[PDB]
């Protein structure tokens, strides 16, 4: 609970069954929890009924087992060297799930990230990884200044532009800079719209927004994020948080996506 | 700038803050408007807890954002 | 030797170092003053990311030079 290695387990009535989800007390394990909550919700990993507390070690061990059990799609005895490599490098980044997982978003599409071992953890498990940090087409300057650049590339580009003699580059630097300031919470309306259309009905996925990872789903054409903060541990009726705006003004719902209340 | 703080009862608290304000400051402002002691307050934005010692700016909390107020673990 | 580290927010960090110091050392100093983990730090100077195993001297970083600190996107 208070200890970093420990986490409070919340039991919820999910599709006819008492099902566990893991709550978060401190910043750092969001990625681990986002993945494990999917596995728990899918009933792929199962916990003793009325288990209350769970450790990083445990979560890691369950996750390790799941990853190493994945089979290649080609299912061919020959080759498959590329698959084993993926598995190895995913197992190497695994500890980072508990302490803070790095991602490098592309502002072009909801699924666009620089492909890294971090991303491969999600791929192997067949879990989509999404963001909504998309440059709006309506703004031509941002689309050209940002272009196909990743977050990592864009910040260096800004530094260069800041130092450049070429007044066109200076100008581009300032537009890119402006884009990062106004979209600092890492979700744009365009991105939210694009994500709502792209996500699949009933599918569980991981959503990276504002230096956080959430378990996301789509139900009746509407995006929802699993409520994990331990502040809501005792609130059985607060399971899913609606995702229909960028300013955080959400509606809470129960396990079955019905609006809840505490009054 | 203005932010909003929604409780679970449905009540909305309006606050005047600056990006440079710490989470502590914000909790103090909530203690000026409501009866609630800072140490009983736990603030969340976009599903993540806001830790004391960080600023609104640290969490990229811009004007007219909605935060969620719940009760503290410790 | 004294150097400066500018963030994108505009804030500047002063550091006390030696040409022989590794980039890893400098990142450790940045952790001591800001609490940013070394592995989340990317230091930029004269258009290139600074690699951990090289020294300030290797990059020709002399006194009162300004480095730029950018953070990796880490979701906690
Ligand atoms: Cl237990
Ligand atoms: Cl669909
Ligand atoms: Na927007
Ligand atoms: Na699914
Ligand atoms: Na509500
Ligand atoms: Na400068």
Numbering used by the authors:
A (entry chain A): 108 to 370
B (entry chain H): 1 to 74
C (entry chain D): 1 to 76
What does the paper say about this structure?
MINDY1 and MINDY2 are members of the MINDY family of deubiquitinases (DUBs) that have exquisite specificity for cleaving K48-polyUb, yet we have a poor understanding of their catalytic mechanism. Here, we analyze the crystal structures of MINDY1 and MINDY2 alone and in complex with monoUb, di-, and penta-K48-polyUb, identifying 5 distinct Ub binding sites in the catalytic domain that explain how these DUBs sense both Ub chain length and linkage type to cleave K48-polyUb chains. The activity of MINDY1/2 is inhibited by the Cys-loop, and we find that substrate interaction relieves autoinhibition to activate these DUBs. We also find that MINDY1/2 use a non-canonical catalytic triad composed of Cys-His-Thr.
Hence, the mutation of P138 to alanine should dislodge the hydrophobic pocket interactions and result in a more dynamic, flexible loop. To test this possibility, we determined the crystal structures of the MINDY1 P138A mutant on its own and in complex with K48-Ub2. As hypothesized, the absence of P138 results in a less-extensive engagement with the hydrophobic pocket, resulting in a more mobile Cys loop, as suggested by higher b-factors of its residues. In contrast to the WT enzyme, the P138A mutant was readily modified by UbPrg, thereby supporting our notion that the P138A mutation makes the Cys loop more flexible to reduce the steric hinderance to Ub binding. The consequence of a more flexible loop is also underscored by the ability of MINDY1 P138A to cleave diUb, which MINDY1 WT is unable to cleave. Importantly, increasing Cys loop flexibility and thereby catalytic activity with the P138A mutation does not change the linkage specificity of MINDY1 for K48 chains, as the mutant only cleaves K48 chains and no other linkage type. The P138A mutation, which increases the mobility of the Cys loop not only enables transition to the active conformation but also facilitates Ub binding as evidenced by lower Km for pentaUb and binding to diUb.
